Amino acid sequence: YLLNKDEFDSAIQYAEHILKPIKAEDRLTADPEKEDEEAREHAARHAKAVAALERIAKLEHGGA
Amino acid sequence: PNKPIRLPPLKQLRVRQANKAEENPCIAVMSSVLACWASAGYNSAGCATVENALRACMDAPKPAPKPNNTINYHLSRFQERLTQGKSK
Amino acid sequence: EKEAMKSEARRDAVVQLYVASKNFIVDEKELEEHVNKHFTEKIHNASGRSIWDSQKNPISMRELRNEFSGFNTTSAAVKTTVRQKNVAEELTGGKL
Amino acid sequence: MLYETIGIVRPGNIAEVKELVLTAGKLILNQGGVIRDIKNWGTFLLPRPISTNQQRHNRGHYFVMRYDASIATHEEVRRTMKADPRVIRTANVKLGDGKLETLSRFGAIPWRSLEEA
Amino acid sequence: QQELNIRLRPSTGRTFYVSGHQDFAGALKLLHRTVAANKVKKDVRLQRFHERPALKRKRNLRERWRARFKEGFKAAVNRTFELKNQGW
Amino acid sequence: VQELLQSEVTSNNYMRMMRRRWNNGDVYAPRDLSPYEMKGRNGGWVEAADVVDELGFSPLDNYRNFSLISDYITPFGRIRHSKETGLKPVNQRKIAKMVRRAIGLGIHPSVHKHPEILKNSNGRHLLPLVVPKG
Amino acid sequence: ELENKTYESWKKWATTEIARQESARASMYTNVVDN
Amino acid sequence: GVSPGGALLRTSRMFSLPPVIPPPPGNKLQMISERASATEAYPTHQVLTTFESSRSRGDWGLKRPLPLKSTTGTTYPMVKVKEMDSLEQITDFTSGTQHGLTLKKFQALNIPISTPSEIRPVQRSVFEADTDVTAFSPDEQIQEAEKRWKFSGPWLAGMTPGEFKEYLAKTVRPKRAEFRKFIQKKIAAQKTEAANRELQEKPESITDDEVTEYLRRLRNDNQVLYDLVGQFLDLAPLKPPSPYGGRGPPITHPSAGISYLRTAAYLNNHPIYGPQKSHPPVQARVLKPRRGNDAKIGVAGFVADGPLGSVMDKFDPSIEGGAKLWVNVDKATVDSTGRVQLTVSDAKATDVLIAKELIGDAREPIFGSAPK
Amino acid sequence: DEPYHFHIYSHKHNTHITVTKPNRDALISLSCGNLGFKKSNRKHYDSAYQLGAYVVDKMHQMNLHNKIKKMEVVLRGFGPGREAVIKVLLGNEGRMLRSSIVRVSDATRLKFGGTRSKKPRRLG
RNA sequence: AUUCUGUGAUACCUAGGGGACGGGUAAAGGCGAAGGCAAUCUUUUAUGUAAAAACUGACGUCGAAGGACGAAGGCAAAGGGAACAAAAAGGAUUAGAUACCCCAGUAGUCUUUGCAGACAAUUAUGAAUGCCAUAGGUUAGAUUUUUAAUUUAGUCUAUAAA
Ligand SMILES: [K+]
Ligand SMILES: [K+]
Ligand SMILES: [K+]
Ligand SMILES: [K+]
Ligand SMILES: [K+]
Ligand SMILES: [Mg+2]
Ligand SMILES: [Mg+2]
Ligand SMILES: [Mg+2]
Ligand SMILES: [Mg+2]
Ligand SMILES: [Mg+2]
Ligand SMILES: [Mg+2]
Ligand SMILES: [Mg+2]
Ligand SMILES: [Mg+2]
Ligand SMILES: [Mg+2]
Ligand SMILES: [Mg+2]
Ligand SMILES: [Mg+2]
Ligand SMILES: [Mg+2]
Ligand SMILES: [Mg+2]
Ligand SMILES: [Mg+2]
Ligand SMILES: [Mg+2]
Ligand SMILES: [Mg+2]
């Protein structure tokens, strides 16, 4: 799809940043067990995205 | 869907039959009489009414014809203005 | 700059494909868990044994025209939010 | 490329339709593909009674599968499906225009809505 | 149905049912309009003999022009009365 | 009291002749009540615009929609002309090819509308059945 | 007042046009046998 | 810079004709009739008039004189010109009385046009200086954006799925760079509000990476961002989090130029009966009786819903000229589609007798022969 | 339960009328030649009308106007009998059967391509 | 009339098998150098068109010959064979009837591999370049105050100068 490893990696790093769960705006009432779990759900959800996207953008899966 | 075309130049823009050539109003009545004879028989009594209606046709006068339709006169006025021209 | 615009447009398409990757199946574990959940004999309100039973019919033209001619009335609320969000994402560049 | 396969299997036994989905699914994942969605439509009427493998079928168990795979993988799904005697009929299609913007808007298989394009 | 299966055949599509506001004579009229709109009678006449591709292409061109000429003629006839009404 | 029933018949009769649906805000003149305006010389219920562009969907990507196929075929399974659909030649070809694909793939009938759509339309209990005959 | 005079013209047309349908409708059947 | 001939044509009268405005919008996906067409919601062409000495000659200031049969005889000379010269070498014109006299009949009701209300009836004029404004400053905040009525951006709920995609692709997509600047100007207010609030005990306004982070912070609160996005694209408010965001903003002036009165809070001083309690009634025509179970009435040429309350229930061919009903026009407003909608209400009994008395239709006159 | 059928096959040279059971087994399969009409007299509109009246009459003898509660009329072909037989059912002969009709179908056979037809005739 | 049918036809059904063909959509529509190309999925192939930029920098047009492609029919080989149908033959019509019409019917049409090279293979108009005034349609885009105008490349209709 007219992509390259550079543009592809730049998009992944950009999507992970804008979708990164923002922690509590303060530390007073910051709930730990609810923030640490969102970090794993984002990390796990991120790894799944990199795997799926690496397979869709693969040039070996293209046509003529 | 496209719009109506612009007619090419014609020798004359007109309709063949300006006035509707209506049909004899009783040819339909006879068909009803002929329809009963096929289902109820000839010398039956059920068809005794339709036969009276058929006899009533010819005893009545023929309606007079309508005045001619002036459509063709107006079509000839706007021909060059409505089509691509007029053939010579 | 003209080639950057083509690169930024090519990037937004990958960010949208990144968000949509939540529901994809990439390993046999998710495949099995997905099939065992949706492929059962009493999933379509069993009674009913077809998607036509649970969901009446696939949306037709009449149903697509009534959404913009007949009603206009509250369904426009949920429709106004999804559109109000798309304008923000495509303008902000993010995925609000 | 993004493909979509509609499979119509014999009705009556749910274990059969589950074995075909897993067989065609594991074949896509092992070959390096990505399955985007698998919808389970139940058993309803066929376009007309069709006979296959010495049986007269009036209904069929539908199911749609949308996946990103290669040409070789796609041609093996069609070959394995067609070769199986439990499938009444199969329909395969290549979704989208082949571009990245249109290909990024294909998610879940719709029933009460359209494919935005 | 769950017990008996529907008879899915070309006649299934050309079927019209009798109901409260539609009697047998009403279903016949509806059947004739749909059979005419779908040009079932024309197909039976064209499928009686074989028409090689060139003759079919040239027959369509003659019929397609007469349809445009007739449609463009009705627009000029009615455009003439729109102007006559204005007094031109 | 039967004399009251015939009134309902005469009333609905005239209601059928008023071939117009009045709406709020619609301006009308003394001429909009004459026969020439109520007759409705327009013998066609033309469509406003190209729905394929207004709804913004790709037909080929929606071939699996059985209701969409039955909407663009006549009861006899014949694709509808652009006169009825009111589509542009480009969108007419996409919807025609969308019908041929569904029928060609063998997921939609070719001589009538989908069976599951006939089960819901009027005449449900009257659909032609197949007696086992044995 | 102009609407009144125009409404009447429609009433006469409707009254004369409905008689056409009811008459042509009843006469649709070939009940001319008078059994 | 222009020749004396070109200078005269500019200020000419025929050159001052307004362009033909688009017709009143209707259901986009709904079917319509293309051959025949009735009167429109509001006029789209200008109505023309002449002197009585010129009309007899057929001169209407147009290219050619109009035919006398179709333009003479009536009382009000009114004409609508569709093309000053068509391909038939004729001036395609029609009568303009369907709208010219609908305006005079409406203004005869002597009622203003109020802002749409929700259902404490408070009829507020639409010409108020606080609401009727179109010129706004970039500093214009959000709380005062609801008073406006003319927005540059479209109403997202009213667009079709196709028009919305074309909008996202050709209007908002190429405005990303401009929007980032719009944030920087806000940051100038964010760093100065906290840096200048203690001096009484501007910032660089140019950043690249700080903007990217500020937008992320707003992902937890989507409402504060929509107010920031809408303010930039100039979108009409949608939901309360007020100015009747149900059907959308009006496509025209709230009054539509049909009436310029600002209130109906006045009493009619009768010659013999002194001031009146309510405005004089107006006779309406019944259209489409209940037996849709809703009735329609024609008041001053406009169609409205019958009063909330027979003649409006069942059709009666015995009534001459149709069924007619005396009513009082309570409120008049202009919806978002350009239509003029009236909230008609049934008229009192004594009032209809007072009105009929002047015109000479009252059977028992309230004056002279009214002992009780 | 499926209704009875009143197939009416009519073409340029003859007309066939078949009354079948719900399972589509023929009860009365007659043609214009069954009434004695010879080679060319079978195409006449009048001969198709008598066949319709004859079949309707034979149904009464078999006591089918009481046995048949639901019936379907299937039309095939556009010959003279398509209109003739309809006026029999719609006329005074089908008075008893007209009330049991629930469907009106058309079974005219068309081919979407199909085998090649005869070559056009040169009559002149 | 020859012909089919009591060895049960036509008509109405059920269950299996086979071969080709391609209804609507469809249009003055499109595509290719031409011949020609119209059901559907996947795979695969060279041009062409629109708008913006960037790039090469005359790298272009025509083209005897050679080579390639080239409708239908036909030859050769191996398949296929439902339908249609030269031939051969029968029944009619006719002064006579090879014929036109009819009952039937083999090559052939279809598949694969070669041969063959003739066509009203036509726009009765070789290809290409520069240029000359308008109008009304239509096909695929582009721009816009996307209503409707403007514009690029096609195609057709009717005219001006000629
Ligand atoms: K027989
Ligand atoms: K050719
Ligand atoms: K033959
Ligand atoms: K011979
Ligand atoms: K052109
Ligand atoms: Mg022959
Ligand atoms: Mg001769
Ligand atoms: Mg047998
Ligand atoms: Mg085959
Ligand atoms: Mg076709
Ligand atoms: Mg080309
Ligand atoms: Mg060359
Ligand atoms: Mg050469
Ligand atoms: Mg050859
Ligand atoms: Mg050969
Ligand atoms: Mg051979
Ligand atoms: Mg060939
Ligand atoms: Mg060769
Ligand atoms: Mg040729
Ligand atoms: Mg040459
Ligand atoms: Mg062409």
Q: What key phrases describe this protein's structure?
A:
part of a larger assembly, 9 chains, H: 372 residues, alpha+beta, five-stranded antiparallel sheet, three-stranded antiparallel sheet, 10 strands, globular, I: 124 residues, alpha/beta, five-stranded mixed sheet, 5 strands, binds potassium ion, binds magnesium ion, RNA-binding, mitochondrion (chain F)
Straight-line distance between termini of chain C: 26 Å
Strand-residue proportion of chain C:
under 5%
Oligomeric state of this protein: part of a larger assembly
| DSSP E strands of chain A, number | 0
Quick one: biggest sheet of chain A? none
Order of helices and strands of chain A: HH
Bound molecules: potassium ion, magnesium ion
Subcellular location (chain A): Mitochondrion
Family (chain A): Belongs to the universal ribosomal protein uS15 family.
Protein name (chain A): Small ribosomal subunit protein uS15m
Family (chain D): Belongs to the bacterial ribosomal protein bS6 family.
Helix-strand blueprint:
This is part of a larger assembly, with 9 protein chains of 9 kinds.
Chain A lengths: L4 H14 L13 H25 L8
Chain D lengths: L1 E8 L4 H17 L3 E6 L3 E9 L4 E13 L2 H13 L3 E8 L5 H4 L14
Helix pairs in contact in D: 1-2
Chain E lengths: L4 E2 L3 H4 L1 E3 L6 H14 L2 H7 L6 H34 L2
The complex binds potassium ion (5 copies) and magnesium ion (MG) (16 copies).
Chain F binds one RNA strand of 162 nucleotides through helix 6.
Description:
The structure is cut from a larger assembly and holds 9 protein chains of 9 kinds. Chain A is mostly helical. Chain A is 61% helix and 0% strand. Chain A is built from 2 helices and no strands. Chain F has 7 helices and 1 strand. Chain F has helices at residues 2-17, 35-38, 51-55, 66-71, 82-85, 89-105, 115-118, and one strand at residues 129-130. Chain H is α+β, with helices and mostly antiparallel strands and 372 residues long. In chain H, the strands form 3 sheets. A 5-stranded antiparallel sheet of chain H has the order 8-7-6-9-10, with no helix packed on it. In chain H, strands 1-2-3 form a 3-stranded antiparallel sheet. In chain H, strands 4-5 form a two-stranded antiparallel ribbon. Chain H is globular, with a radius of gyration of 28 Å. The chains are: A mainly alpha (64), B mainly alpha (88), C mainly alpha (96), D alpha+beta (117), E mainly alpha (88), F mainly alpha (134), G mainly alpha (35), H alpha+beta (372), I alpha/beta (124). The F-H interface holds F 7-8, 10-11, 14-15, 18, 20-29, 31-32, 37, 40-49, 51, 53-57 and H 26-36, 38-42, 97-99, 101-102, 160-165, 287-288, 291, 296, 298, 301-305, 314-317, 335, 337-341. Strand 2 (15-17) of chain E pairs antiparallel with strand 5 (101-106) of chain I, so a sheet runs across the interface. The structure holds potassium ion (5 copies) and magnesium ion (16 copies). One potassium ion binds next to strand 3 of chain I. Chain F binds one RNA strand of 162 nucleotides through residues 72-74, 76-82, 85, 89-90, 92-93, 95-97, 99-106, 110-111, 130-134.
